[model samples]
Target: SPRRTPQSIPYQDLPHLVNADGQYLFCRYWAPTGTPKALIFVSHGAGEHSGRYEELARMLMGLDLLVFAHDHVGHGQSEGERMVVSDFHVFVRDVLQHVDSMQKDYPGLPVFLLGHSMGGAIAILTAAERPGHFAGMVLISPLVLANPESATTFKVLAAKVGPIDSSVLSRNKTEVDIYNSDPLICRAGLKVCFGIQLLNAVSRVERALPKLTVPFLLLQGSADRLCDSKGAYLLMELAKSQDKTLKIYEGAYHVLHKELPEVTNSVFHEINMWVSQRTA
Candidate 1:
């Protein structure tokens, strides 16, 4: 299927910003109806763009929270080779830079970090690098580590593999189909270099757990195949945050926010409630 332009959402804009390396990065911001109570900067997962997060942003807007997200270089509207990067740390830095820019624009408002899947790994690295910068962190089925068996296989064959297909990210066929058909989703196999960088990042994030000091909410589904729930539980034990919470949803898939209405809505409500209580 040919990829078509993503339908525009109300009160959203596709903007561009130059990163520290002077590369043009694609960005999206959702303006609130009135004054925003806080700001949320989202980092989306690999092979996925920020556009898919429109619904999540809308939910946050209803709570008077401004939403901003950006496509990482080589992903979505961002400038770079498709689904490739020299270093995974660049992705983390891009997020940190975006948060810095938003803070300057919306000074004094609480700023939260929301990330899913690989984006969750980026969020964790960013929090570790810039502790005390964010008011809170929200992770929805973050990919702290890949399945152990999968990791071993990849490590052994990363150099031999081309781009690894990610069509099996979710258990829901509809969700997988939608992702597969989305023109924006990267259809290529995972690059060996990028895979190495990601694997290194996951290891580093796990080791940096003690540096995570800000309040963070970690949500994961026990049935997630791409990212095991055991990693989430390990993160909970490793994180030194004084106010940390973890919830493991039974029978849920990897993308809770993209799950069925009843499921996604519950996830969103949990997020809203958690952030509300902390920001209050």
Candidate 2:
């Protein structure tokens, strides 16, 4: 069966200040109403791009919240060896640069960081790297470390080889069942190079745990296979911020934003509420 076409939304592409590997990176910018009071910059996980979140962005826009999301260096429309990388720290830097660019649009308005899976790991590093730049951040099933063996072995190999091009399995995002509801939907043809970079980023954030002070909202689902709930729990318990909150869905998969209408609405409602509380 053909995958369902994503619903159309009002959005435009904006170019990044610099291209990665000679490929111009871009973001889909959506403003439900003009001149939004705050900006939400999203980061996606490995092997996926910003377009996958169009529906979620539309929802945010509908609430008069502006949304910005772009493809990472090796994913989506961005330039690089497709699904390959030698350094994941560079990807983190790319996210930071893009978020910084997004902030320039609404300098004084509150800014929120939203990352899913690999993006969540990167978001943690980004927020902690520059705590004062963002008002708060939301981690949706962030992938800190999946399995003990794989995490340890990959880091060892990547450090030795610099990077490798290993294939990843693909997540099945059939139209009838998008990333929202399926905990097992993923493609894993992951390149060795990309994997190494991701490991580096995850490691960096884990080490910075004691120093992270930004307000955070960590969303975890009981069924997420890609990341353990322990990481989110640790974040909620350890982060120095007083406003951290954790919302756990009993059965939600990795991508809660793609879940049914009610679940999706609830996720954004929390996001909106958090944004409103902090900004006010």
Candidate 3:
């Protein structure tokens, strides 16, 4: 089923932008009724699209923050095979392309980079490549290191055995079911080549971690089965930013935004507070 564009939210729709690789990226812009204080550019996870952040976008708009997000190539409405990428830096480049457009439209305002899962890795590398371009960063359960079960070796076996039987993403059954049922989700198991590229991207981010100098807030779940919390700690320790924060949520799952009501509320609140203080 195709995703229905929301009729309720006041947003600017960019039909698409063709990247250097000739991939058409779908994008959207969300802003408050009043003037915005800052801009938040988002990079979603591997198998998800910007539409999943619709709820979060509304919340940020409530805080007087403008939100912009685009589907990466090979994901969502973008051009490419689901969850496939030729090179990881392509992701970073695509993000910078969007940043250029956003900066042009909303000149003189501060811009912040926000990423989740693999998107987090892209965000880190993007910030590293263009330091001081963003005011701050927000990372949620970033994929700095692959989990044990889904490492290169396991993915190879999973690919050979059968891509259909590879179900080692989340510890929470509800999340699994939700992801499987989501119309915009990439239902098939990730491709082996894509997995290899992801590993390479992680390595690239690791090498560039010490180059990150902007204030960043990292949030992770201790019980997340997909991404390790240690990666969050490593980022905190390695980043040269004078202001960095790492918050670990105990017993929570990988998708903190879709967690229980209280949990998600807290996450949104923390983000709102952080942006308010920093953007001011």
Candidate 4:
């Protein structure tokens, strides 16, 4: 069933339960007047926040799907020492807390996770650690790889140094060339927090990749500059769930949802369509 457009209603921002060490987390909800069929929790990449997903949420709202998205501790409206992290796992912990909080609010209806880039890694880690939390997941050009081999030496050194000087955003560096092809993603906001989180996310993925139990739909661009399309196939190979599928768009870039409207609409349509069938 299609949802009617919410008229003259404002999206509300809920206050965070806790904020400290310059890290602030928040959840914004877009819902109609009545009960929603189900809820979808959204997570975004590093250096980016949940607000960037408003356009996609609008589309989901039209589909009668309630949307909940949060800004991670260091990005967007969240309070955090700019691009600083004592441990990369803090981001995942924050998101998990939000998930638990939301589950208590809306019971019984299925809950799904939609993660991109950094959020993808975090979502996968969380779902693997606690399989019963979500009905399914959608990963868009997730940063599962540790970057191309040309920078292996750099990542190796960071793994050693990040724990010691994790607060210094400069210690973590991402070459613009790694994501130069995608115009929707920003590069200036990243710092050490970005680098530190990447290392931690990499380790988590390697540990949890083979144990994933939830159904997943992985969408990747054949020409994505940031993530390896092969990793998408690899996930399809490694996932323990029998219900999973991978779809690749021939020339889509890393930011598939922010790409051309034709592509974006199709990408999100696939998401709601898949979730609808599974939850129905």
Candidate 5:
């Protein structure tokens, strides 16, 4: 059925899908010119949208990957109240729905997941629910644990103040403002219920880790203040993937893909190398 995005654009007029809850999710696709080797599903972080992955997606396209992603519900141009979600499953469920529909159009392609920050949590749980489906998973600073008070304070803090300082996002000024001035980013502050869903995802990722057999790549920024770097270390140690690897970038912060040119290039190189080798 046709639906309208938060921006009032008809879903039928754009690359999009209607989720089970009947919400329109704006999607983006970066496909190789020729036959692709794999399907890459990118899940962006909280307060971030899929459009921010342009650079990374273009890189994957060069590798002949069919890269695709959507603005998660309530994010970017998706239809929903800003920063509001009923449950973490609402996200995972929507992700699966999109992937399922895509896989139908391009059947038999090896599916992969690339999630950042909160999206990483969604990627983790998505793979967990359907263990052997993904060919590989890449988690960039995934959320693994949240101190009780850590998430609880955000509702009050943001309500009193405003958006987080963009300096913590990356060392690159251009990249920081790219995110800063994005009109689609939610600035309404995180809701209290959203915090609960976060802790829920944090706890769930651990349980999923023990049984996770999917090969994965974990990238961490040693100085990341947002999603703790410790969680990256913990993920590598806990996941049962026989082919798991952790690469920590020194002095780098969160949002590695948008970090310093040196750091961002290194990230692109690492992801392409890892993905190409597996797809081959």
Candidate 6:
């Protein structure tokens, strides 16, 4: 394929890279002043793209941390099937590729993974593959289990599920409005094939957890409907990591960073403290 921009936006005008498949991946970078002590790569959740992370990124930038991310293959400005993936590992592969590219640009800077929901699962599988590559990880309601009883449902292979109700995303009406209004957010239901890939990721995450020893912080919402809080608890119990934290926000919803003002501020505060302490 000939070179061209994604979503009609000029790739040359923005930070982007063409993957091995020759598809353009839209990227975001937030560089901190006075040299970054560490690098944080964001793996955004399913449906929502990385653009929503600017608020969280701003907080991290204050700590002299370089924050970077890319929209997944089929989401945001990236080129591919909408809300679909040929394989789950393809996401993992892209992440590895992006991390390599960034690490080269910022050589010797310790790296960290910060992911939410499906993206959180991506970080888990990614860290498991490399083993001891990152300074730490921060997972926000990651998909660590497939049990519907815990709302960890990848919903089996049937793939006939309803589109997510935007209202259930956060307690903050303004955030909910932004989520609904954002054209980059994929509001469609999971594809018949994409549903299976999520289960594939969940399988890999669970298998890797038993021996996973990466120090990390997990943020979860007690009343989250998308990914159950129990999964967070399970990670705490199962992972062999010497350093792990599970902070559950009482009465909060799935998107804690985008939840009510108090919840959002506290979530940011928790991450800032946790990440800064570790980066040192």
Candidate with maximal lDDT: 5
- The residue ranges of model 6 lying beyond 4 angstroms of the native Cα positions read 1-6, 148-161
User: Per-residue lDDT tens digits of candidate 2, residues 147-214?
Assistant: 66877887777678722121111122443344333332234466556666666776787787787887
Q: Per-residue alpha-carbon lDDT of model 4 for 118-188, expressed as tens digits? A: 88988898788887677888899887877556346556756676222211211112322323434333446
Alpha-carbon RMSD, each predicted model: 4.3, 6.6, 4.7, 8.9, 2.8, 2.5
Q: Rank the candidates by lDDT, best first.
A: 5, 6, 1, 3, 4, 2
lDDT of 3: 0.81
What TM-score against the true fold does each predicted structure earn? 0.89, 0.80, 0.87, 0.80, 0.94, 0.93
Off-target runs (Cα >4 Å) in candidate 2 are: 1-17, 20-22, 155-188, 260-262
lDDT, candidates in the order shown: 0.81, 0.69, 0.81, 0.71, 0.88, 0.88
CA shift at 144, candidate 2, in angstroms? 1.8
TM-score of 5: 0.94
Q: Report lDDT (Cα) of residue 164, candidate 6.
A: 87
Better candidate number, 5 or 6, judged by lDDT:
5
Candidate 2's C-alpha lDDT?
0.69
For model 3, the superposed segments whose C-alpha errors exceed 4 Å read 1-14, 147-177
lDDT score at residue 2, model 6, on the 0-100 scale = 46
Question: Total clashing residue pairs per candidate?
Answer: 4, 21, 0, 6, 0, 0
Cα lDDT tens digits, model 3, 1-280, are 4322232222224466778987677887788898888889889998888988888889888889989888898887777767878888899999999888878988999999889998999999998998888899988899898665666595676478534321344445666677778777776667788887888888898888788898998989887777877888888998889999988888877888777666678888888888889987
After superposing candidate 5 on the true structure, give the runs of residues whose Cα lies further than 4 Å from its correct spot.
1-3, 151-162
Worst 10 residues of 5 by lDDT: 154-163
